[PDB]
Amino acid sequence: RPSELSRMSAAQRQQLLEEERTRFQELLASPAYRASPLVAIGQTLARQMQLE
Amino acid sequence: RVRTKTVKKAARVIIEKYYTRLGNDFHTNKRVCEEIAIIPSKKLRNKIAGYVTHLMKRIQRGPVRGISIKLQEEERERRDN
Amino acid sequence: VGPRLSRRILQQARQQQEELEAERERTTRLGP
Amino acid sequence: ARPGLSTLSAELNAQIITALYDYVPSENDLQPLLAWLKVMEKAHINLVRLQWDLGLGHLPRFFGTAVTCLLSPHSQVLTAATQSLKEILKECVAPHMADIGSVTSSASGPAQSVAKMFRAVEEGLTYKFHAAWSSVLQLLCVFFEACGRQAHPVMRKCLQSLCDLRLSPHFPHTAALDQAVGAAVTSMGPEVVLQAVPLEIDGSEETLDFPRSWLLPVIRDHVQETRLGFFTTYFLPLANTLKSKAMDLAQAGSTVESKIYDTLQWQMWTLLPGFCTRPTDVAISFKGLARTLGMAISERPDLRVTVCQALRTLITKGCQAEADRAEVSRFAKNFLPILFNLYGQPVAPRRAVLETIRTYLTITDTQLVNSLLEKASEKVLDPASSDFTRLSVLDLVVALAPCADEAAISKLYSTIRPYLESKAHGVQKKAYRVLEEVCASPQGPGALFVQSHLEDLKKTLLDSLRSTSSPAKRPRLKCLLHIVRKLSAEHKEFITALIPEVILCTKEVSVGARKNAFALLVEMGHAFLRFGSNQEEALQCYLVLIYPGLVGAVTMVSCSILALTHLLFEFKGLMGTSTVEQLLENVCLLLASRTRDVVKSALGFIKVAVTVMDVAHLAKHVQLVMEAIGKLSDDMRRHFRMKLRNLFTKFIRKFGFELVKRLLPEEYHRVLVNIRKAEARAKGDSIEEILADSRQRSRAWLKEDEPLNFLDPKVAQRVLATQPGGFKVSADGRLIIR
RNA sequence: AGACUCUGGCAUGCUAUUCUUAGAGGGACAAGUGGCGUUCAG
């Protein structure tokens, strides 16, 4: 799976969309993403950068 | 995009030399320029055909006297050789 | 002929025409 | 000031103007002479406004001097004179021309003044001027435009005399002279013009250089208000004979005369788009041209682009009245079966045909739309059809869509609904194209379909998501564009299920669906302004639904900032400025990721954020934004060089100059002073004319044959206004280009 | 605010080859439609 969307096949783009559909519907109903939306997103990039 | 001077200088010489044998559409003079100029780069052949096609869309709208005398001299050099 | 000679010819040819067509106090009041 | 009747009477002005004729200072002093003919303009325009029929009475004597005073050697005399003369003609003659009516050579009343108007300007055309000719031709052009229709019986002398000017060996005003004759043809009409100047291309000639070939380009670009009956009775007999003549010499082996006579006939098929701009007789003469056009479109490939362009002029600007609309619609039963054949014929200017189709169904009856919709649907459902034939009629379905009734559209939608999961991308693209265009009609039977199948379309657009290919997205978004605009409040389940695709559509393969995606995300917000009374929190509901796209994969996190970039450009103050800085703060953390896609969208955000967000609230975040920018990388600076250099320019113009050096590291110091350097830096269609390698106006060349006579009426031919008089070849003979 | 260089999307086409390969050949050129346009550049 290449980083940019122009390189993989049209079929390979579709499961990128269908996995994206799952990731919102598990997160928009998540308990943390109801009080401080900007804080949770910023904390998510805080740990993601720290790991990488 | 803008047109490079080497395309434009190559454009003018073809029309004044082989006007009779070429046509009005992009597809026709793409066939002709493959048969008239060597054109080592394919992208150059792409650009030179369209800009020839652009002029030929324009020159057809002009008065035909400029066309008529140019056809007079075209065969004149042609029958001599 | 050229620019300098023709300018003098046209100006001279015009002035000969005018002396063929040729052969008071200004109206200070406007209501008679 | 244009005073009233109590201040200035009408009979007083006649005494003033007749008195002022005695000064005319000499010829060439330029200081009062500009002011002298400025008031004779102003006095005459006032005299016309009070009593108009007396106003034409005093006009000829002024135009006697005005033509004569064009010979003054000062340029500013020439510009002011014709500017006076044009403003008389545009204001004192043009509205009052209709009451005069047609004028002959033997007029008596005020129309006799109009005879003296034009007899004055004709004297402005002879040899004595030879430097005012660009100015005189402008005068004739407006004079033709205003008075051409009701003075054509007298104007036939100039059109001969305009013709003989172009026979001069080198006329620099060839471009202007065509403008004079061109406007003249617009008012008078070519049938009058061609009687004064006859075309000599009437079939057979001894020569090959037709000295009056310039008329045909002139007529094409200017005919708009002529009866169509002239083109049928004159040009088509000449059109067919010339076409027949060229084929006869084609088989004779001579390819020069046949190529000439082909070029002549093609140019005189181009008059028909001119002739069908605004016909006055389209109600009766269109019956004379249906079948000849029907033959000339089927078995003549060269004339196809002319006729298909020619019809589009007739429908759009020649169909204003309801009576003219019938006979075009009456002939729709003939042209569609012809035009359907040309589009589907295997190989050609297909796209020229399709646009002609799209216009022609907009004027036709709906029952014949329904009938051919059934027949075209038979060709689609027929398994004995090739793929090219299948896709060819699929476009024909798209054209046939919006003009159907509600019944045929529902049958068509049921036909196309199983096709949206097709693995063939060409079929799937046309399938979404059908569903797109039926929602594109904002009124009529298509608008009725919208609320009728409103749940059926919603489930169809959602279950077809999983088998949607990359090229098929572009009609899908435009399909989504037209239903969000008419979506009710109880449809947030549709909208929130539509967000992850459209934000992913911002960075798809094409650019066509990207601008479709950007435009939709705007109106996705406009959907949410109509769903709440208090606007800001509604759009706050909008952005919190897309924020989890900032955390995930490298494809989507770069996608999400691009949408947030375009959202802030359109809903600038609707966000609430307090919301902005946190978003800028999160993208600062995003700025440090090594992947070049995320920093591509991150820098674009910072570029647009400084424009939208105010300088005082940006002043609270100057330190934080370039703290990340300074410690990015070496290559990342080297790659995104001017993009960083652009955002440097935005700060120092809007903020203090010294402030940025104290926060930047050492390397950007010498770069920044180059920007202070930059801000101190800021403080006509003939063959020869088109193939170009790209005091002073009073010079005349006499020519010396038969001896020159200045009193000859054709002496203006023999005086001129301007100057008289590389690659490598292969052994094959082919050119070598590099 | 790169008019620098090179290059990608899709190949049921060729080579030892529709699913993994790596060399080559196609394709895309503002190409076409309509507006804003000095009506030509954009």
The first and second tokens of residue D210, run together, are: 């037709």
Burial class (CB in 10 A: 0-12, 13-18, 19+), C26: exposed
Whether residues B59 and D687 touch (CB distance < 8 A) is answered with: yes
Q: How far is CA D164 from CA D63, D168, D211, D524, D718, in A?
A: 24, 7, 10, 66, 11
Whether residues A20 and D507 touch (CB distance < 8 A) is answered with: no
D210: chain B residues, CB-CB within 8 Å: 64-65, 68
Element (DSSP H or E) covering residue A40: helix A37-51
Breaks (C-N over 2.5 A) in chain C follow: 23
Whether residues D734 and B55 touch (CB distance < 8 A) is answered with: no
Taking the C1' atom of every nucleotide in all shown strands and the CA of B47, the nearest one is E29
Q: How far is CA B79 from CA B19, B72, D246, in A?
A: 16, 11, 21
The first and second tokens of residue A51, run together, are: 């790991």
CB-CB contact of D132 with D85 (8 Å): no
**How many domains are contained in chain B?**
1
| Sequence-ordered list of residues with C-beta below 8 angstroms from that of D395, at least 6 positions apart, any chain | D343, D354, D430
B/A touch flag: 3 or more CB pairs below 8 Å: no
| Cβ neighbours, 10 Å, residue D699 | 17
Among candidates D15, D19, D701 on the partner chain, residue whose Cβ is nearest the Cβ of C6? D701
Chain D: residues touching B (Cβ < 8 Å): 208-211, 213-214, 216-217, 220, 255-256, 259-260, 263-264, 266-267, 270, 685-688, 690-691, 693, 726-727, 730, 734-738
Q: At what angle do helices D554-570 and D512-529 cross, to 10 degrees?
A: 60
Would you call D22 an interface residue with chain C, using a CB distance cutoff of 8 Å? yes
Q: Is D702 helix (H, G, I), strand (E, B) or coil?
A: strand
d(CA D42, CA D388): 71
| Cβ neighbours, 10 Å, residue D207 | 8
Nearest CA in chain C to D14: C30
Q: In terms of residue numbers, what domain contains B19?
A: 1-60
Q: Straight-line distance from CA D384 to C1' E18, in Å?
A: 25
Which residues are D701's β-sheet partners? D720
The number of CA neighbours under 13 Å toward the Cβ of D723 is 1
B77: closest CA of chain D, how far (Å): 13
A28: chain D residues, CB-CB within 8 Å: 545, 548
Method: cryo-EM
CB-CB contact of D466 with A18 (8 Å): yes
The first and second tokens of residue D187, run together, are: 């008012």
- Amino acid code (one letter) for D451: Q
Written as one string, the DSSP assignment of D662-690 is: HHS-SHHHHHHHHHHHHHHHH---SHHHH
In a domain, B65, yes or no: no
Locate all alpha helices (DSSP H) within D465-511, ordered by sequence: 473-484, 492-496, 499-504
d(CA D18, CA D290): 61
Q: Is D735 helix (H, G, I), strand (E, B) or coil?
A: strand
Locate all alpha helices (DSSP H) within D8-106, ordered by sequence: 10-20, 32-50, 52-68, 75-88, 97-100
The radius of gyration of chain A from alpha carbons, rounded to an integer in Å, stands at 14
Q: Which chains touch C (3 or more CB pairs under 8 A)?
A: D
Interface contacts B/D by beta carbons within 8 Å: 92
Whether residues A5 and D589 touch (CB distance < 8 A) is answered with: no
The first and second tokens of residue D60, run together, are: 């000829």
Burial class (CB in 10 A: 0-12, 13-18, 19+), C4: exposed
Q: CA-based diameter of chain D, in Å?
A: 94
D370: closest CA of chain A, how far (Å): 36
Residue C12 CA from chain centroid, whole number: 10
Q: Residue B31: give its domain's CATH number.
A: 1.10.60.20
In a domain, B79, yes or no: no
| Cβ neighbours, 10 Å, residue D738 | 11
Among candidates D259, D686, D735 on the partner chain, residue whose Cβ is nearest the Cβ of B66? D686
In a domain, B54, yes or no: yes
d(CA D86, CA D394): 56
| Sequence-ordered list of residues with C-beta below 8 angstroms from that of D37, at least 6 positions apart, any chain | D66, D69, D80, D81, D84
d(CA D21, CA D23): 6
Taking the C1' atom of every nucleotide in all shown strands and the CA of D509, the nearest one is E9
Taking the C1' atom of every nucleotide in all shown strands and the CA of D309, the nearest one is E33
Among candidates B37, B63, B68 on the partner chain, residue whose Cβ is nearest the Cβ of D734? B37
Taking the C1' atom of every nucleotide in all shown strands and the CA of D649, the nearest one is E1
Q: Which residues touch strand E (CB under 7 A)?
A: A 6-10; B 1-3, 26, 42-43, 46-47, 50, 53-54; D 309, 312, 351-352, 355, 470, 509, 607, 639, 641-643, 646, 649, 678
Resolution for the entry shown, Å: 3.5
Q: What is the DSSP letter of D647?
A: H
C/B touch flag: 3 or more CB pairs below 8 Å: no
- Tell me which residue has tokens 């494809």: D555
In a domain, B34, yes or no: yes
Q: At what angle do helices D111-122 and D52-68 cross, to 10 degrees?
A: 10
D211: chain B residues, CB-CB within 8 Å: 65
Dihedrals φ, ψ of D433, to 5°?
A: -65, -35
Nearest CA in chain D to B64: D213
Chain B: residues touching D (Cβ < 8 Å): 6, 9-10, 12-16, 20, 36-40, 44, 48, 55, 58-72, 74-75
Nearest CA in chain C to D22: C26
D737: closest CA of chain B, how far (Å): 6
CB-CB contact of D554 with D602 (8 Å): no
d(CA B1, CA B47): 11
CB-CB contact of D200 with D206 (8 Å): no
Q: Straight-line distance from CA A19 to C1' E18, in Å?
A: 28
Q: How far is CA D289 from CA D55, D266, D296, in A?
A: 47, 18, 10
The radius of gyration of chain B from alpha carbons, rounded to an integer in Å, stands at 13
d(CA D206, CA D711): 32
**Residues 1 through 32 of chain C touching chain D, CB cutoff 8 Å:** 1-3, 5-7, 9-10, 13-14, 26-27, 30-31
Whether residues D266 and B44 touch (CB distance < 8 A) is answered with: no
Q: Is D174 helix (H, G, I), strand (E, B) or coil?
A: helix
Q: What is the DSSP letter of D443?
A: S
d(CA D98, CA D150): 8
Cα dihedral sign, D288-D294-D296-D299: negative
Locate all alpha helices (DSSP H) within chain B, ordered by sequence: 5-17, 26-36, 42-59, 64-80
| Cβ neighbours, 10 Å, residue D392 | 18
Dihedrals φ, ψ of D193, to 5°?
A: -65, -45
Protein CB footprint (7 Å) on chain E nucleotides: 1-3, 8-11, 26-34, 41-42
- Amino acid code (one letter) for D11: E
The first and second tokens of residue D186, run together, are: 């617009």
Taking the C1' atom of every nucleotide in all shown strands and the CA of D645, the nearest one is E1
Q: Which chains touch D (3 or more CB pairs under 8 A)?
A: A, B, C
d(CA D383, CA D390): 9
Task: Give the pairing type, strands D719-720 and D728-729.
Answer: unpaired
In a domain, B69, yes or no: no
d(CA D520, CA D541): 17
Taking the C1' atom of every nucleotide in all shown strands and the CA of D643, the nearest one is E1
Q: What angle do CA D217, D222, D224 make, to 5 degrees?
A: 135
Whether residues D551 and A44 touch (CB distance < 8 A) is answered with: yes
Taking the C1' atom of every nucleotide in all shown strands and the CA of D512, the nearest one is E30
In a domain, B78, yes or no: no
In a domain, B73, yes or no: no
The first and second tokens of residue D118, run together, are: 């034009």
In a domain, B2, yes or no: yes
The number of CA neighbours under 13 Å toward the Cβ of D429 is 14
Q: What is the DSSP letter of D92?
A: I
Interface test with chain D among B8, B57, B59, B65, by most D beta carbons within 10 Å: B65
D687: chain B residues, CB-CB within 8 Å: 59, 62, 66-67, 70
- For residue D662, give the nearest of D647, D654, D652 by alpha carbon: D652
